[PDB]
Symmetry: C4
Subunit: 314 residues, 4 copies
């Protein structure tokens, strides 16, 4: 069967209201990044050199999520960034480790000095590592996870991007603690255009979720988040958290520099968004509203007691 099935994106679907007993304000946004690391808000900042470095990591950890420092920098640079976050100086939801230090992660891809990079990152006391690949379901990435897990047994791992059930089983089999889902979710995406490859996000999430169900392996929904409603759908589909890049690129904390163009403000050029905190408030508000609509008091309820209708567009 060449054409296996129809895949759904965020816009091909909508959530059906349910009898509710909770108000958006009584809802809990706590979730799991891994079985060992929880988050206070289900958001992660992308490992893009355009969105996450020490300032973004600190800002979002103080809000309850976690930032993943990008790998497009020297090994020394990446270590220092981790240390900046870890040695930081009200924020009720701040996410800290058992040593009261702000949480933070770092991305790494296959290179000649990956092991060397990881070693330095672990010395900086990074909380979690992201094996960053465009195609996580590969023999090279599988072997890379094995090596890292043998050399650093207690280092939590989020394994490369996948969109299938078979990929989830393989990565889990070698110790992946969390699976990051997301490959060619949109027609405008580079993988879809260049390689003609990819699977719509809702189907992607539902697929790996319908595989990792009953297990203690978490799921991160990475990419394509345009609105708070997308976060709601991503979690209802089965994600434990969501990784965001674009929507944060214009914030003050992004690695970019602030530019004032004829009375207007930008980051360089994307329009200024203000403190990350403001965008996050907007996003958690929408998530809470959505949970109110579905009668979910926790993230876990949103994932199990939720149903969609297919949108014939128009």
């Amino acid at each position: 069967n060449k054409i296996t099935k129809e895949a759904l994106t965020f816009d091909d679907v909508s959530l059906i209201p349910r009898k509710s007993s909770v108000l958006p304000s009584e809802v809990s946004l706590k979730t799991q990044l891994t079985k060992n690391i929880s988050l206070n808000i289900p958001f992660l900042s992308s490992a893009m050199d355009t969105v996450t470095e020490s300032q973004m990591a600190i800002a979002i950890a103080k809000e309850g999520g976690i930032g993943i420092i990008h790998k497009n920098m020297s090994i020394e640079a990446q270590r220092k960034e981790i240390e900046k976050v870890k040695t930081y100086k009200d924020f009720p939801n701040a996410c800290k480790d058992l040593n009261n230090k702000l949480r933070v992660g770092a991305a790494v891809s296959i290179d000649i000095d990956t092991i060397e990079r990881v070693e330095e990152l672990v010395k900086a006391h990074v909380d979690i590592l992201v094996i960053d690949s465009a195609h996580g379901h590969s023999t090279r990435i599988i072997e890379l996870i094995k090596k890292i897990k043998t050399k650093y047994p207690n280092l939590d791992l989020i394994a490369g991007n996948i969109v299938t059930k078979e990929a989830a089983l393989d990565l889990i089999s070698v110790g992946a603690d969390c699976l990051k889902v997301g490959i060619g979710p949109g027609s405008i995406c580079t993988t879809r255009i260049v390689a003609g490859v990819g699977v719509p996000q809702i189907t992607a999430i539902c697929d790996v979720y319908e595989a990792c169900n009953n297990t203690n392996i978490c799921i991160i929904a990475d990419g394509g988040i345009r609105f708070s409603g997308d976060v709601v759908k991503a979690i209802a589909a089965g994600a434990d958290s969501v990784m965001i890049g674009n929507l944060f690129a214009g914030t003050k904390e992004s690695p970019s520099e602030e530019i004032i163009y004829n009375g207007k403000k930008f980051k360089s050029m994307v329009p200024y968004s203000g403190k990350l905190k403001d965008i996050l408030t907007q996003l958690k508000g929408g998530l809470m509203s959505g949970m109110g609509y579905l009668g979910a008091a926790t993230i876990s309820d949103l994932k199990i007691n939720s149903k969609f209708v297919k949108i014939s567009h128009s």
Copy 2:
């Protein structure tokens, strides 16, 4: 089954002509708001602070429909507005109460002084009350209906916005006299965007209708009416009446103020539409034409003897 089914909006559907015996001019637009209150034309003006106050209420009641005064005002203000309508000074279709006073309704939402608001509204002799909620299928709204119906047994109630059969059963169970259907009908709608929640209007209407069928509970189709054809489809789907906001926002009677911008006219800014009466004539004309096409002499015939074909767009 996560993805329960495909939902239809107004544009995903079209009505199939039927053998007709009546001319658009011989058709009756009479319908029911509740089992105790009928209307001469199946239209209601939205409880939006941008469309319905005393002037809109009077204008549409004189035409045969009913206006619902918005709640974004003091309790004293809302009472006075009701009195203005009720103490008003040819219009053959005017809709009046047994005391020959123009019909009028008022919206109320959950607040610290809802009961207090209702008391004053009932003193003003309001004909019907709208429990205004974005999510009517909630324990708080259900309890609110119980309280209001115990304190004011003869006050007709339209209960919060719903899009499901289960919600219809719950609200009906506590005395709702009419159900207002409408939640995230369009992708551009705030609930769909912010909360990722919502169900296309035709499916929404068909769903609660296919539940309240055989009962004496009426249905109001609220929101998304862009053209007269949408009204026809809404009723054919099962609605007894339709609530309109946007299309009336530019009329003279809307709470807005008239503004003349360089030779053009506006309401503030939406383009001027003229007397509500003119827009209504356009809307009832289209409804009559549609009923002529389906051989329906009454609103009731439009709802039972009507079928759609699904539009594959294009």
Copy 3:
């Protein structure tokens, strides 16, 4: 079953090539308007006051089709127009009656003097009459056909616009010689917008055709023709001929007046198209090409030996 089925427009479908033995130039465009009146090219000019009067009628009859004089004029005027065509003064395909006079038809709708109008039209020796209604499936139109067929037994009749099998049976039952199919074929169409009524053209044609099959009643596909490819699809769906309005509105022969706007030319304002003959050549060429692709030597072959694939757009 409220939502009976999915209906198809011209764009939701495409024709599948077949083994061909004929060249576009060896193909025959001859078809039937009624069992008694044939045409040399399967085209009719719309009974719109913006496209068909004596000049359009003459021009298209000289090409092999037939024009239908619109009814938006006095009874005396409409009679004279018929006479102008009938008393006209190389064109190998010219379509003439047994008396060597150019063919021509006239539209008539329900009015106080329809019978009176017809009488004068019949005196002018009109070849065929069009009972022009937006909803042909009505008791009034059915009775009108009965009356006309009793008072003028040999007058060929095309009966009002329909889109259903039941309508086809009723109109046929009272003597309709040809059925004109076409109601709310497009979302932008006035009936779809105003009355929320209508059925996509391909399904409409297929539907009445799959009813009038095996009978001697012909089918005219009226409206929505934008390209020559639409004509091909319309006939493959089951039409014997196609009625065109818009595409002819800009021709020299249309009732409009020629206007020169800053070096450009128009009809009043639609852009000038030139002699009808030129547009017709373009349209018959495309039809012939399409028949070549399907191995159809005649119109009849195009209708029976033809299959479509559904276009999922994109």
Copy 4:
């Protein structure tokens, strides 16, 4: 069954990642044009007078593909062009014949002197011939193949454009060595617009492929290639190679002349693309990336071990 099925274009589909063991750089782009002629890269330059003449043919053959000289020129001219390519003077992938001369093909259509044209082309030592027709599934083209194969038994033939299984069987039956697939793939295409004929490319390819499977007859996917991802999908659907026109029209080597418009560069007017070699590098890169995503080391693996999901758009 008038409406046989739903057909898919490039955009209605996306490829599903698979467990991979190969890196894009370790992949082999070698493929077959016919059982007797292989190519080093699965690309052909269109037989359009706007893209392929001696310069385009040389450029792409030096890269590993083959150019097909267009037929819109005198027989003498077309012969000379072949000779220029065949007598050409690092490029590791160059595609040459057993005599170390650059490969090249030539298009021919039904005319009064087709046989005469072929004779001269064969004297020029053309490697393969393209029977160029808009509708290859015709008795005239079938007879033309028979004649050419009797007069030139060792001349490899690519037979006219088809989109069906029945056409593939007929052309194969008279000696076609390769089948070129492609007719009205897009709604904007001239055949779809003018003749209302055509079948989406993915379904077209899958259809003839699911017929020529298990045979030694190759398939060329001709037309509609906008991005490298389209090439990947075309091959995964069953094509052995892909014919490209538009994307090459702006290259330096195209028959066009270079024009500098106010600081910008063009070909005449389409924007300059630079050396074909650069566009090809972009296209083979995307193909390799796509093969990496599917774990295909060869073109053959891409065709057999590949699956798509249907894109509900949005």
